[PDB]
């Protein structure tokens, strides 16, 4: 009942259905996801930051992040490849992520790796 992180493509997030606040792919539910993509745009909102993050699998998805401007423990620039860990969300039928970490990739071999992780993770659920 806790706590599982499924690596995903943005299109996999789009394909997920929402019944009574529960997101499902097949008979399996999430919640917590990682994706890897590029920051296309970055807005400063009143209470947080809205990134548009593009993995090539669909149109960019909105991802909200919170930052403490008196800390480095600062907006990631556009054109950056980024790993994202967050929770899947939906308001008024619009999918988006709520992020807990946004780690810029210094080694793009992590991006290759993530693809394989996506693929194997969904081979696994598929069998459930």
């Amino acid at each position: 009942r806790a706590q599982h992180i499924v690596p995903c493509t943005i299109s996999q997030l789009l394909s997920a259905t929402l019944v009574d606040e529960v997101f499902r792919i097949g008979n399996v539910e999430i919640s917590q996801v990682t994706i890897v993509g590029i920051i296309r745009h970055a807005e400063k909102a009143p209470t947080n930051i809205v990134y548009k993050i593009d993995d090539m699998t669909a149109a960019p998805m909105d991802v909200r992040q919170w930052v403490d401007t008196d800390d480095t423990s600062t907006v990631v620039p556009p054109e950056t490849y980024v790993k994202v860990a967050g929770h899947l969300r939906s308001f008024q039928n619009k999918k988006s992520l709520v992020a807990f970490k946004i780690m810029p990739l210094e080694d793009m071999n992590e991006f290759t790796t993530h693809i394989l992780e996506v693929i194997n993770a969904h081979m696994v659920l598929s069998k459930a």
Binding site: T57, A58, M108, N109
Partner: protein, 114 residues
């Protein structure tokens, strides 16, 4: 403005099979036309794909380049956008990136093609 479409990740050998489709092509910069309006990339099995631009490059390009564009009737790519990969820590293993591509096209159901 194909930034809101799915873009298949492909190697050179699938250019023919993706004519007219939006694509994302990763390879190593082999050569640049004197005009800056086309250049060549090689993928992880040493195959070439020709990339074309409506306007000349702004800057030097080298190493691994990730190009987004539409595959042309002649199996070329019209570049809409590109990003240069950095390799400050570890060099990008292009060969395994190519293995990863093959896998995407063998299992579209697990890397939903958008």
């Amino acid at each position: 403005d194909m930034m809101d479409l799915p873009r298949s990740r492909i190697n050179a050998g699938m250019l023919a099979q993706f004519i007219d489709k939006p694509v994302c092509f990763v390879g190593r910069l082999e050569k640049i036309h004197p005009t800056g309006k086309m250049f060549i990339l090689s993928d992880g099995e040493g195959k070439n794909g020709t990339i074309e631009l409506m306007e000349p490059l702004d800057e030097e390009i080298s190493g691994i380049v990730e190009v987004v564009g539409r595959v042309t009737a002649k199996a070329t790519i019209l570049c809409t956008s590109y990003v240069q990969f950095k390799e400050d820590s570890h060099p990008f293993d292009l060969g395994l990136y190519n293995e990863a591509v093959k896998i995407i096209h063998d299992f579209p159901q697990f890397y939903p093609l958008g």
